[PDB]
A paper describes a structure:
The AAV vectors are composed of non-enveloped T = 1 icosahedral capsids, consisting of 60 viral proteins (VP), and package single-stranded DNA transgene cassettes. The presence of pre-existing neutralizing antibodies in large portions of the human population poses a significant challenge for AAV-mediated gene therapy, primarily targeting the capsid leading to vector inactivation and loss of treatment efficacy. This study structurally characterizes the interactions of 21 human-derived neutralizing antibodies from three patients treated with the AAV9 vector, Zolgensma®, utilizing high-resolution cryo-electron microscopy. These complex structures provide unprecedented details of the mAbs binding interfaces, with many antibodies inducing structural perturbations of the capsid upon binding.
In each map, the capsid was well ordered, while the densities for the Fabs above the 2-fold axis could not be interpreted for model building. For the sixteen 2-fold binding Fabs, this strategy resulted in maps reconstructed to 2.54–3.56 Å resolution. The localized reconstructions with C2 symmetry relaxation confirmed that only a single Fab is bound at the 2-fold region. In all maps, the VH and VL chains are well-ordered, enabling the building of atomic models. The epitopes for the sixteen 2-fold Fabs comprise VR-III to -VII, and -IX of the AAV9 capsid. On the aa level, all 2-fold-Fabs contact D532 and Y706. Other frequently contacted residues are T491, T492, R533, D556, N562, N704, and Y705, which are clustered around the 2-fold symmetry axis. While, for AAV9 capsids in absence of Fabs the residues 704–707 adopt the same conformation in both symmetry-related VR-IX loops surrounding the 2-fold axis, there are numerous variations of side-chain orientations in the different Fab complex structures.
Author numbering:
A (entry chain C): 492 to 552
B (entry chain C): 615 to 654, 672 to 736
C (entry chain C): 221 to 430
D (entry chain D): 239 to 295, 307 to 427, 473 to 688
E (entry chain F): 221 to 654, 672 to 736
F (entry chain E): 419 to 491, 563 to 610, 622 to 634
G (entry chain H): 20 to 142
H (entry chain L): 23 to 127
Write the structure that this text describes.
Amino acid sequence: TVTQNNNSEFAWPGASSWALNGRNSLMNPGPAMASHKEGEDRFFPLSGSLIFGKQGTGRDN
Amino acid sequence: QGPIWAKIPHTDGNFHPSPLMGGFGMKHPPPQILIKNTPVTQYSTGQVSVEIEWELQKENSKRWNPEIQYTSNYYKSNNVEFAVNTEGVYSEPRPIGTRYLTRNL
Amino acid sequence: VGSSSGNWHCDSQWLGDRVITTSTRTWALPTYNNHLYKQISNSTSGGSSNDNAYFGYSTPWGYFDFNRFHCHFSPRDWQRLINNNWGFRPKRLNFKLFNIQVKEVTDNNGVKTIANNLTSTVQVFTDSDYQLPYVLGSAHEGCLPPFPADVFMIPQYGYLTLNDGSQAVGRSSFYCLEYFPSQMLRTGNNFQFSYEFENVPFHSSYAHSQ
Amino acid sequence: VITTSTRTWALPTYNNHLYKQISNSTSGGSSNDNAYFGYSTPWGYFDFNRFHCHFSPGFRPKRLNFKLFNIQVKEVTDNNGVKTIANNLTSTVQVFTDSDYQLPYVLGSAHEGCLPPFPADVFMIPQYGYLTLNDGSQAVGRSSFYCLEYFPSQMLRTGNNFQFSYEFENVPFHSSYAVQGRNYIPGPSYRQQRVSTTVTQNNNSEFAWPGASSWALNGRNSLMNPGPAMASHKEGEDRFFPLSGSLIFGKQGTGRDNVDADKVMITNEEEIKTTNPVATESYGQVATNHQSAQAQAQTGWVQNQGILPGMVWQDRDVYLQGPIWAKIPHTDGNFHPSPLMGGFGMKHPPPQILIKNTPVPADPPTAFNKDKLNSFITQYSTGQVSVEIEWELQ
Amino acid sequence: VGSSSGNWHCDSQWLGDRVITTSTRTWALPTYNNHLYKQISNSTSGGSSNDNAYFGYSTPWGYFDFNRFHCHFSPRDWQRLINNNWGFRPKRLNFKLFNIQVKEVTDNNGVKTIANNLTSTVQVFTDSDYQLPYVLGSAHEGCLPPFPADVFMIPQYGYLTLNDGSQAVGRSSFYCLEYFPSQMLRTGNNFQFSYEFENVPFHSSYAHSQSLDRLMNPLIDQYLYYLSKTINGSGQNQQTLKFSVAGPSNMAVQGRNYIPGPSYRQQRVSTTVTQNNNSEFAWPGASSWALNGRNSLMNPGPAMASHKEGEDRFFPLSGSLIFGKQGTGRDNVDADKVMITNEEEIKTTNPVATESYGQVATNHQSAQAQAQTGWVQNQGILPGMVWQDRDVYLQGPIWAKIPHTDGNFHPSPLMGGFGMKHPPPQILIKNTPVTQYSTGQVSVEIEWELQKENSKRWNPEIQYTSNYYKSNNVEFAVNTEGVYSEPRPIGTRYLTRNL
Amino acid sequence: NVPFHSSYAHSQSLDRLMNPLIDQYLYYLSKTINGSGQNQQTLKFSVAGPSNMAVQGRNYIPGPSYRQQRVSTEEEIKTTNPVATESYGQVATNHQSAQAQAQTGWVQNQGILPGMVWQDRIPHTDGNFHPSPL
Amino acid sequence: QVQLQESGPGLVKSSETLSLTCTVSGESISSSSHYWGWIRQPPGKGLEFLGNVYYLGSTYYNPSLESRVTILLDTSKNQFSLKVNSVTVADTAVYYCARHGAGSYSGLFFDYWGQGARVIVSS
Amino acid sequence: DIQMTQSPSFVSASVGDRVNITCRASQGINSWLAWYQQKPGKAPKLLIYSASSLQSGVPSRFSGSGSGTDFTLTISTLQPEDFATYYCQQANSFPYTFGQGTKVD
């Protein structure tokens, strides 16, 4: 649900990321962990899930 | 839709090499297969058949009530799932986990 | 030239504790980088950030990638796995390549010309000593198609090495794949090799009830 | 008796090398009974199921043999008006047989596209598609999608050939011969409407759809044709025929829509009349109540009569143009599997033979593009077919 | 005394194409009719009707019933069976009875006291020549209970014979079970026999992916012709005969090889109550058959699909096996207390039970006579018909005994399961007459055969899954009181096959 | 080799094969109305049991029937075989609804159905059923 | 195109649970990836949100309704059911089914609506 | 909850005349809105989503631009086809709330 999210750009700034040789790396998919607490499924971890795409899905945005 | 294997970077050590996107971490995975057209505008075509032999571990459990199994719906959709539309476009509607049967902890 | 160098095998044979899945696809290989090794770096594409910095090469060599499951399992087959089994793992891999057809194009005015080139060869080899970079682990596109009737296109082979920004360093390694002994196939030859998977723990396909 | 047939075929490239869903909606509107769901395939198939394939102008099949040779592939380049046709010597042709009967069996519906009767004719291989479970024009989830590329098949360049043999399971030898208490009674009847070719006699109304005997399944009326074997007309009256009672063939050159009666050849059942009822007549009468001094005995007409102990009947006569075998649907039970259009019902009929032209991709974009290549060389192939069937005469 | 005569076995082994399902329960056998063979008839209840008349004897013997599926198959095994297999059938039957215990009850003032009786015996015999009437095949109560921990009570054995009203006829046969040789067991003795099922065809568990009328190739016209138009246009003397090619444009008129199975129409009732008229039509409007002056309701009858596609609510009146939910009363329970089973799978090859079979012509047309047709309410077998038998359920019966006659057609019983001329023999039991009752352990073991699923279908099957959504208690499991319950009936057909 | 001609009379009626002492786990529709009145429709199910033996579900049905007219001036087979002078069964025809009451027609003649059993009392052809002569 | 039909009783006794069901034709709830939600229109008054259910089964309820409503998602039959408990005279209006989402506005604005279902709570 | 108040409760304005309906959120909704249209007895149908973005089905005449505390639905060149109540919806914060209604004539 788009509106439960904060009104700012936190896509790269707020994401988890491991740094190597002064170059920041996003943690995708990350260590193996449950995606959400039982009973709430709207939410998902930012980078923590393999995200495929449906056919015809564009390559951007 | 996901990967099968990934090569373990050759290093001093590692902890639980199983790769993070899933599958089987290996120190000698299936070798790469490289191909090119020998220079002589040129392109080539043909067939490729690949065969992997998979081994199984059967479900031995004594659970009384029925398992949760993966199923296909029956609600008269316009086109069947995992099949082609009228344009011959094979579309995989949803990703399928491997985990349905149940074990004890 | 006039006789089929291989057959068509796609099926799955469910036998006892083992499963044999065989997938066959039809591919197309163009020519990349005009038969040249070409250096590539972000400086070519604009090199916005230091995080995205890379220094590497692009080779005319293409490669086969079968690394995704849906290549091997039809949806129904897969169903017969997740439903009935607490684990699986690969044992043997047997790969075949054949029925090579080399085409050539001389473009004249609007309509291009395409006809058989009989004396042409197609080089193919495997890296079983692991001296090259291994790019099959990063989940790139270009794999065998999910659906058998889809004809696909062999991806281009590329690799990266040590860098500081777009510049290189002394320790950067440059691999010429021509330097590898490789088999050469004309339109009648075929290519085949087999592989024995090393021991890996069963993947778990069960959900704990506790 | 041993007959051999040999022909030459031309198999084009179907569906642009695509599997396309075909549905009722795509080619039709309304038509509740008519609506269907299914897929069309690039694959063609060989249908020799008709008699005149094997026969030039009691018996039953015994063995079979099939050969496919002289494979000639032709790649078609087209520049402006004229088109160039060049041999492509490296091209391949895939063919397999379905010996497990895993695919839908469509040979039994008496479709056109058979080997032609005259040995010099060159025929075009008919395309293969199938129909599956549907609701209206939509498809319930119990439906099946079969991808034919997923069956192991044999690829053939210009030097290869493909042969196999088959063994007919034992079927009944076809028969080719014609107020006292009695031990036996005439066979079953499910009545047909009666029509006479002279239009002056028949009624001046549109009774063609309504008049015919139908059977309803899942709320779809599907006309009964030809129906249980029955003599077509009473003795001496040959002008009359049941509306859906017997097979009707078109004469050479007959049009597809609204042809006259003299363009089509109506078959007649007059031979079997001894042991079977007339398709237009009631099986008999029955007492409809109890007689009394206060009520007369009433009789009433039997329109449909199932099997009763002591019936005998003749099957329907096969014709030189008619079908040979029809697969028996796989079900918990069936009575007298002999097909209603004539011939030998077999739980394992001769396997279907599926063949396509392996697609040859055109020039790739030279930069990697993950889309499937839809751009192919216009192509078709040709070859030979020799099918040989041993028979046994009584 | 102090040496156990058997053990407890309750597991199913899955080996290749065969299944081995062992069932062991505990039982309590009282003494019925105080050791007396007694006559019974309708006049005992009054016999308000002629159709309800019965004349028979009731015997002290009890009899074991494993004849329902859920005796042998846990709901998990049943899932593994219905999902992965296209058919099954019983091969062997192996029965043991052991750990006998005899307890006497001597009532003294307030409390009744229960003590062992060591010298007492329990008479058991099985009729393997089938010379007694066979009561196991009517879907009677008293079968081994579904859940293994329950204790069950052996049902009393009684039989019926010829009757006119409540009176007998000279042919009525009276069988005294004491006339058969039997075996007698004290607390140390045990009893076992083994059986071998006669050859039966596989029960076909699958639902066709093609409908009987869709067998055709959709792309190709037939070479047969049909009569499209009987008139050119409006007017006098305008009759014509115009033929067309059978093809996809008009699909339904093509010629076909085979025709749907028989039908004997049932009335249709709506789960929604407001869609029914205010009249009592349960008995009066029900399809029934008549025998020797008695009307017998037709239940369930031939196998026919319950409803047209899309209609869940309508069900044939007497034509669908109805099961009770856990804890449902005997008399006049409301419609949500019972489980109704719908024949959705059989619609492809079988007619809808609430719909006509078809139409036929009722007269000859002419200029003076229009074409007149009328509906077909029932259709006997005609050559070429194909049909699906009735489905078997977890709660439903397994086998029946084919009546012994000169002829029959398709003996497969109408309530589902495997019709046999030599089913598993009845097992009769009683206490030896000296208030006394005996208990023990029943163990039945059947070996099943399986037909594996070969299909090439590309897209995933319909499977039987247990819903994930949370709830107060798990399906097919006990509740806080301890009362075992089976939520819904389970059919055997979840897979598919080409028609 | 033709079968032994059965030479006996059954001691049981095809509808009386049941056990008289024990209930069935099957249910039958019993009341379709709460009682006399308007808008009374309801559905009530009750166990088929020895009290009512008409509605108990049975595995087999009596044999084929083709009605003969009765005349007033084989009684061994009447156990499993319908009376030749009687209507073999009653079949419901039209569907009920708030407008229309259920109607039931009489079946004078009924061919074979799966599950029939019957008692007794060759022309060379493609097919025949239960060849035993009349 | 997405057609939405509601069904269930049109009369319910007070303090008896109310049950409606919405069977969506034209999409597949499991693979559509959109939110499905209910609202209610007490007669002659403004519509008030009841709750929605995301295709994986997660659910949001309206706090105004005090833990009465429960939205069950039956994905195989492609329909979802509203159940509100201990019904009162006040809780009677036309109940609309709706698809709560779109590409940009998923789980926000209701683009496709049911035909409507009248429910009259009465004694 | 967040209140919603449409300023005209009943606006009688006939054919051809421009009409504007305004509804103010109790607290800032950050331009998340959804105007609806209900003809009598039928279910409502969406008109404008977000702040000014028109729905595919609806005719060009409907328009509106919110400043985030203020919102207006301007029906330009009102045709007789639509005389109906008009509701607005907040998407900003749960629970979603449809204020009152604006009946137009």
